[PDB]
Amino acid sequence: HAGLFNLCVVVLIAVNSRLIIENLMKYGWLIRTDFWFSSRSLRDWPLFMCCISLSIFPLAAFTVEKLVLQKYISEPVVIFLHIIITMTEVLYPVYVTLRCDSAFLSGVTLMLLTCIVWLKLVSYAHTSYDIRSLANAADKANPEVSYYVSLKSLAYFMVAPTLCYQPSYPRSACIRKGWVARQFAKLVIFTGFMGFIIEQYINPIVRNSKHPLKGDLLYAIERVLKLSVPNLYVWLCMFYCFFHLWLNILAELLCFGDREFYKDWWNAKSVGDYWRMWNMPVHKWMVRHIYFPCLRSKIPKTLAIIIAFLVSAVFHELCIAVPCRLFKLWAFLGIMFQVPLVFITNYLQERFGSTVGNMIFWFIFCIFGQPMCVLLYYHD
Template identity: 75%
Template sequence: MAANLNEASDLNFSLRRRTGGISSTTVPDSSSETSSSEADYLDGGKGAADVKDRGDGAVEFQNSMKNVERIEKHESRVGLDSRFTYRPSVPAHRTIKESPLSSDAIFKQSHAGLFNLCIVVLVAVNSRLIIENLMKYGWLIRSGFWFSSRSLRDWPLFMCCLTLPVFPLAAFLFEKLAQKNLISEPVVVLLHIVNTTAAVLYPVLVILRCDSAFMSGVTLMLFACIVWLKLVSYAHTNYDMRALTKSVEKGDTPLSSQNMDYSFDVNIKSLAYFMVAPTLCYQISYPRTPYVRKGWVVRQFVKLIIFTGLMGFIIEQYINPIVQNSQHPLKGNFLYAIERVLKLSVPNLYVWLCMFYCLFHLWLNILAELLCFGDREFYKDWWNAKTVEEYWRMWNMPVHKWMVRHIYFPCLRNGIPKGVAFVISFLVSAVFHELCIAVPCHIFKLWAFFGIMLQVPLVLITSYLQNKFRSSMVGNMMFWFSFCIFGQPMCLLLYYHDLMNRNGKME
């Protein structure tokens, strides 16, 4: 201990020898020169040469900091107690540091505490609003919210849903005949076109002929569109596999693809797995997980039930009263319409986020776990999207992969410009959005169609803003406002009032 104290005395003596700062000769070291960036900073960006001309104070200060750090390391190594460690003569300011919330340092550290604060405030504010709403309006959820006598009238839609597997079986038959060379390639293409078209038109006709509930019609149309997308992928992939197999037999395949396995067999097992798997892109085999985690599946099902109930509560307790007490947004007072849209935007955003979590995270992961489906990238961090284009590339990965594989790149391979191929992809998406909403409503005003097609100029605008300001915040805020704060509530009000006008319940 005496030796340690003597070393500390020597070190402290060397510290006391400094004048106007710790001398650079206190602890000789080869690192006595400051870096150019530090000199630039100390001199207001004028350069290290100017700092040297102004005097040795800045250099001595930097060297002093390095000497102090070496002294502290030595003290910690020799094990001195606190009486000899933090002396008043030791400088408190040693390095160049930014404030944690400055623009240069804000994204270099964790903000988990602030995120937790936002969650606490969000829970507190919404809890107060829920209590206030219940005290003012009471319990608005109807007894027949989940099931009513009207649901019994939807049995034609249910039977239509049960008969949809006929179309995949027909596609399998066409591919089997083509594999055995019993029908020509143009005939196979024609049969697939007829089959996929019938897979969509059949549910549309059933819905239009029946006075069914809106949710029943939406559910059936979603299933029909999924079947259509899967059948297109199945037919397109098999067509391409046959073409590649013929190229291999002729020796026309490129060198980069000679090691790929183009042998395939059309079998019902692979098609059946594909039709229930959480993907829209057909391939012969998929990455698989080794086993099913039963406890994990149960926990996800419990979450699915809870968040589905939360969606129902928000819809019945908040969205329905706001929509019913509103006017047509394009026929009434402009300021009143803006107020209704903004008031509807918050509960609509909650329902949309719950829907995303239930469908893309919980349900698709449950389905993937039960089927041991390995690739579970059903979405990316779309909430960080800087442009509308990034959002559409990350929000729904199964549809995005399908679009790229069966629409966008086939257009490019056929000589179509990138911009036109991009618009065609949005056009296909707009048609199916319109079918899923307009058909169950029995209204064809094309609000959903135009809503999707308006994303094309928004892509250009947000991309321009991103390139101009070089900030991820500008495009991200533009996306949230245009899509969630304004777009969805406006579309909801338009369809509701058009539906009421169709039924003769409103003027």
């Protein structure tokens, strides 16, 4: 069934083929300019070696786990230590990306690694607290603790493309190395295709006069789809590069038991259905750590969805607005608009059809969607 997905790059080689064949070798006129990392030689940036400076805090979580598992201090004190460790995870890399500053894309990938490491840390803390509360009911404890293997399990969880820590993981085989290279080659060519389609389509169409949109929109609703359809293909190729290619490569090199991350997000009859569908690991993180602890007792789901999307709004604002240090709160409000939207398109999809719900999903994803974040990300 893969040829109709395959046709979407045939028509991108085919339309403006001429501006594809004017390059010398591997986009010789557009190299290290789009999806760019300047000075590929040496490749030593003081935030790139500070991308491994956030790895001393998983070691700090292992030291406070060693304090509570060798009975150095009580459980509440360690919980406070986890709270301060994951708030230093907020406060320290924003100080890294403001003071002794660097490029915007390096700041964006540092904030994305900060967000992913924060989820991985909070999931490690919640799973360690759950297995400590399970193990303290009886006097079984844990003989043969194997702190090298626990260190390797925590570090292997930190490089893993999932956000749910277990000490025992499903594994696979790493004998297919030509496949790994083929996926990497597919990723690099798409990256070059990403830079080509950003420089040829979005960059001449954003670089003009623009105005902030209002409640009334007369003769201005044609721009929010015409400047969003190449952004729709940019987000589709971003999804294919991250969730189908890079996460599958990082699953394969670490020998992961499930390449399960992307799951059926194109047949979304509504958003809300879409946000529970579009990636497995962060949706498993919300249904394991925030929504379902709210749904254990005394909070219903009709504020749990708002507080889960509030912390997702906080993560998107920390990912986008902080490396540009402008504090727009446009991705915050643009995804806070989605939270009444999930409820709306559910009232619209009731007494209706799934097909026209998918039509209005792709319209919602066109205008008030995730390519809007890339549009505001290429508007600074």
